[PDB]
From a paper:
Among them, the L-type amino acid transporter 1 (LAT1; SLC7A5) is notable for its broad substrate specificity, transporting not only essential neutral amino acids such as ʟ-Leu and ʟ-Phe, but also the basic amino acid ʟ-His, non-essential neutral amino acids ʟ-Cys and ʟ-Tyr, bulkier derivatives such as thyroid hormones (e.g., T4 and T3), and amino acid mustards such as melphalan. In this study, by combining the lipid nanodisc system and cryo-EM, we have resolved the structures of LAT1 bound to different compounds in three major conformations, outward-facing, occluded and inward-facing, delineating the transport cycle and the structural changes associated with inhibition.
The structure of LAT1 bound to JPH203 shows an outward-facing conformation with the extracellular halves of TM1 and TM6 (named TM1b and TM6a) widely open. Unexpectedly, the 5-amino-2-phenylbenzoxazol side group is not accommodated in the previously proposed “distal pocket” surrounded by TM6 and TM10, but instead faces TM3 in an opposite direction and is partially exposed to the extracellular solvent. Furthermore, JPH203 introduces a kink on TM10 with its nitrogen atom wedging into the helix. Together, these interactions widen the substrate binding pocket of LAT1 and fix it in the wide, outward-open conformation.
Author numbering:
A (entry chain A): 162 to 630
B (entry chain L): 1 to 217
C (entry chain B): 43 to 222, 233 to 507
D (entry chain H): 1 to 220
Write the structure that this text describes.
Amino acid sequence: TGLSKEELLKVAGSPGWVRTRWALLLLFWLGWLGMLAGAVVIIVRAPRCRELPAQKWWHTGALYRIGDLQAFQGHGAGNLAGLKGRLDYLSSLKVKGLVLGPIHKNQKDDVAQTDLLQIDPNFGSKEDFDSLLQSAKKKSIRVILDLTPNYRGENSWFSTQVDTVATKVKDALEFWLQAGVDGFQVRDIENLKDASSFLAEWQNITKGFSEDRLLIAGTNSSDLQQILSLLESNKDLLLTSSYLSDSGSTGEHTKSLVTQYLNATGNRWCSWSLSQARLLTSFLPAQLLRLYQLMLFTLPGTPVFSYGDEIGLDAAALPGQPMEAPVMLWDESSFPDIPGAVSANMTVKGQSEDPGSLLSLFRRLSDQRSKERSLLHGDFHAFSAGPGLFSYIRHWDQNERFLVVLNFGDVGLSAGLQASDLPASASLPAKADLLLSTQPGREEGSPLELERLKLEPHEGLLLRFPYAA
Amino acid sequence: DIVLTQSPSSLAMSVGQKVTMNCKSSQSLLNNNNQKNYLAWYQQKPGQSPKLLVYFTSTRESGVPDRFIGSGSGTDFTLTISSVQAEDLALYYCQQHYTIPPTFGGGTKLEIKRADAAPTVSIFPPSSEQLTSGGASVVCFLNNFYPKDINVKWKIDGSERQNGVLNSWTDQDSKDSTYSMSSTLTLTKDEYERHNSYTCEATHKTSTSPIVKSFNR
Amino acid sequence: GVTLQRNITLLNGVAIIVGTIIGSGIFVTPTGVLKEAGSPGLALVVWAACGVFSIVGALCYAELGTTISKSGGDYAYMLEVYGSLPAFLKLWIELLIIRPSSQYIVALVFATYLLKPLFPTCPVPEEAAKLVACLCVLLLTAVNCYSVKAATRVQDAFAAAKLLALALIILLGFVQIGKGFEGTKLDVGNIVLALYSGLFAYGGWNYLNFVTEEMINPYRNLPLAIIISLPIVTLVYVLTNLAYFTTLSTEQMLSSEAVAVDFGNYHLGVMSWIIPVFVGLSCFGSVNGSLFTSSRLFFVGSREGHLPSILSMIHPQLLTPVPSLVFTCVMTLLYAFSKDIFSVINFFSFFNWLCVALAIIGMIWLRHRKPELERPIKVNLALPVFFILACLFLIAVSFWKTPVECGIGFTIILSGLPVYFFGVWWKNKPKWLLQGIFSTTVLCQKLMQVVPQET
Amino acid sequence: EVQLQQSGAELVKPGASVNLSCKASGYTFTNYWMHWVRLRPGQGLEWIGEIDPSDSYSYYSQNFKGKATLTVDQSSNTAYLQLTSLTSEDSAVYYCARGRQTYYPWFPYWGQGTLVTVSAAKTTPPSDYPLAPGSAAQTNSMVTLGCLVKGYFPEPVTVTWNSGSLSSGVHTFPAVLQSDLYTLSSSVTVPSSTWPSETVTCNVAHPASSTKVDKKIVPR
Ligand SMILES: Nc1cc(COc2c(Cl)cc(C[C@H](N)C(=O)O)cc2Cl)c2oc(-c3ccccc3)nc2c1
Ligand SMILES: *[C@@H]1O[C@H](CO)[C@@H](O)[C@H](O)[C@H]1NC(C)=O
Ligand SMILES: *[C@@H]1O[C@H](CO)[C@@H](O)[C@H](O)[C@H]1NC(C)=O
Ligand SMILES: *[C@@H]1O[C@H](CO)[C@@H](O)[C@H](O)[C@H]1NC(C)=O
Ligand SMILES: *[C@@H]1O[C@H](CO)[C@@H](O)[C@H](O)[C@H]1NC(C)=O
């Protein structure tokens, strides 16, 4: 053992040791208080967080347009109560939205027999519509309704007496908001006289109801200036267009179409889409479908797909069907009019199983863009990473940073990234984690050496890397 | 990087005949998405830049004679010349263009075969200006012969000389497919002074006896 | 003259157990059960289920600690059955790894969450977080040197802060119902990992046993402080889970890294910062309860000769085991150097349940060997055997979750054998060790005025 | 026409940098990227890198990264390759090349190569010495004439006869390197009527020391 009670007390008593005990008490408290002052110093002399910008629901991920309820389903089941069945698919796509292509009672080119308020009974009843809409709310899919008046006709706003047509809409928006829809799509605004003024009125009506409702305009236009003019007076309008459509058909122009438009609008909110209505595959050749899905899900803004983009549907592949409204391929039954023409891999069922499939890439990306604060509303910095590459970093104040590297040209790179002139806040790491590639045969999850990386023709990469103070 | 083996390294062939280069790539250069093969052939004549012959394995460049046919897929590729002309002697390189940076083959030297011919032999006494330098150079030219293999004896007052002798062959002449060769002997002025009779004699497979030229200073 | 006096009244005994059970767990761990249950219904059932399992285990310790009144708790109950070496191999792992890592981890959770409302959207600065962890550990080993009445008044205060925070959470849940089962991962291989990931949030129920010897009336109050607490915890847990499900959708709880803070953001708006601060103050309570309890484990280990004699010494005018406390603080702060920390604890997933299973197996063997030993509690033998059988399954599950890491842990357990043979079997024979041991001992006694306890 | 052209010859003392320079003509210079390729003797072509004249971005093979440096001058259609840390084994011919498509690497248009020699031995202008047959010269119908080029440096010396007029029947033998100075000789054959009756000159020319010399072949 050691010293006894009495023995320890008698020796401890010595004034030297009593002063030492007093000294060390005081020393300990001084050291802890020093550390307390030190930690308070660190807390104050340290970088603050950036306030999260207030985000409407349509910032938080992809919308999804259904131009004809019949073509999405097959006939007979082509009604709103049919669509109420499908939302578990949509919830799997993580689509924070829907757009029901027009369901109002339109008679072709007849201004007087057309109404924007009564629904066309082929699709069901308002009692069906509400049943859907309540289910969609329950499943976190907001629903927009498309109000373009003459949708069975040639010219969607009719040829004549446009102010009566605008009056129909002015009334319609109020009714359908009271019914509980989250917003409205209108189309073909190049066919509408005095377009900017009517959009300004309808936008005022919508935001004047509530701040969490939107109006999605759409135009057939691909002119940067025309589009910037429709977006001048209206400032929280999504305006879908053909602007990315004229891509050069081996991607070659896209780095430039995208970074001009961001620059020109001043990095406001945007909606990326290759059209106001038609499929991606109406424009892209099919080697780029994967590459565009990587890009549309990772630019600043709300991407928009038409139905079946998520599976690379194509109107031409099963001949005779209209390029307006191709029949969606759920499973091998889905186009029975020429049986045996449907291959397994062309269908939702046939892709849902396969990690390599297009729909397995869409599902995966939709996740990232809807959870990760950096893709949800980070900044965007393009840089010259390589010959073909469109490359850019999405980032937010300290969260995860995402570098995207799209190889649009048809020649692989064999020599790494080699970034000229990164912003000093956003410098590239020596290595970053592959979160996915557009191509099979990659070590997903693993860190890559950016100076010694090798992209194939058309290989896009999504690299994830952590912050630096 | 990709690596391209090329063979044969030499391909000696006769005028009018068909010839074949093989190029062999360490990866496939078929682009699945587009169903064409990324390869090109360049001809480099002696003393000139590379000229592009064909690209995407078969597409002739404009201003290319139609005797160059390129073919193959995957990794076995061949440039063929249907009927070799005297103007075609060159190194030929294959290059991939499936990745940037590209890479090239080590190249096939095409050589021409012709009817054998004996050298025109000529010998030149030292230049009267050179004699100012304290040195002198004696030069023997062997012109327009085939094949390349040759040897030269230098004799000086009958003594055989093997120090300070140098040789240079031309590349094979594209008009006539003959070689030519220069032989040089360099002397001090006093070494050129002390001896009287200089001989260059050349042995070439077209003659049993050597060909001879000589001069007396 | 000098001993650890019986300061702990029943309500402070309930504080030492509820304060160390409620932990960080319920405010951030719900996500772990939804991940393996899929369904709010199956989740809310396994929360109740590992509750009643924990009650059944605690009722075995409510027996053991009345049969054996030593403050070694989980360690003493091994020593009184399996003898010298098996008890040491426990104490070594507790000393070297489990208690100082646990103390540090929960202090760092105190630091981060207490700071969090200065840094809402981003990391709290790491060089600040480690100081504010160390200031906490240092302060509570100061307080637990000054007086056991101060120590237990601190844990009354923070045990109250914890239950107040859960009451506030539950109340806002019912208010949201006043304002107006799903897809289930029904595989047994999913359910077992749901249950095993939930049991962590009850871990702590054994901690009262390491302070049996300082209870005012152990034979009454030690089983009562268990039954007054674990049913209360179980109720509060199933109600708190219920409250989260009124406000956070399944997708949101599967993907939020601080569950209580999201519930705070939804209900309190400008005042949301209250819930982060309560998770912080909640963890402070757990550091104090752990430091207190932990100091007694090493004290007892030295009294029974397993551990160097300085740790048995007490300060005569304050009656707190100052060298054991000081050792426990220092051993905690030595974990502040490590760039990663949770891994070192994850290596011993199996160890807690293994020791518990060995204690209750011990209670079976102790009933066969010495029926004449006094037993104020005598539980129906069904419950021990049920609980043992269940733990032997969970120990296997703990390996099956990660067969590498439980092997690393088992490798480190064998580090106890070198130290046992050098420290116990060798009798410290070399005079250049033995005289140095003594010289260091008498220095420490002099340096902080401490003396051996009196039988 | 499309035509790239380059300086002929560069001498570099080991370890020093050099600028090799390439002026384009006959096309819109910003539309097409410019590539630099090299040809080590007896060892096959190797590609350095390329540059975009529209924004001065440049991409380089792993072997050259940081060792090379491309820039460009849009005001003159000129591309410049800096090379640095040059060793003896970086002696080569450096070729400037243009792509067909905008940056894709296959090379229809090449500049005539810049011959880069890396050596400490000094620039040395050539000494030219004419050769005439002497004894029994006119006894044959065709007569050969010659021009020794001796002790010069660096490698590229050019010979043409009568200002390129006698481009038929000329043999110029590759240079021989001796004691870090080159030796070369050139030869021509003409009718026995021509040589004593007419001007004959080797028009020797040397890019790297600017000397141009027209020695007349006069009988002994
Ligand atoms: N063998 C063993 C034993 C204990 C002690 O017993 C526990 C205690 Cl004292 C507290 C908790 C968590 C607590 N119930 C809470 O709600 O945070 C779990 C266990 Cl197993 C461990 O604690 C921890 C632990 C404590 C806090 C954070 C992270 C890990 N690991 C342990 C390993
Ligand atoms: C449109 O709304 C804005 C507020 O968002 C308001 O300033 C403006 O006066 C409104 N105009 C009309 C005609 O409603
Ligand atoms: C867009 O609409 C205008 C006006 O009717 C028309 O002139 C133009 O050709 C249309 N373009 C497309 C691509 O539809
Ligand atoms: C577009 O980008 C350039 C980048 O240099 C910038 O100078 C310019 O101000 C931006 N905006 C417009 C309208 O050109
Ligand atoms: C799907 O499978 C078919 C049949 O094997 C094949 O021809 C085709 O290339 C595949 N891809 C698509 C999208 O059709």
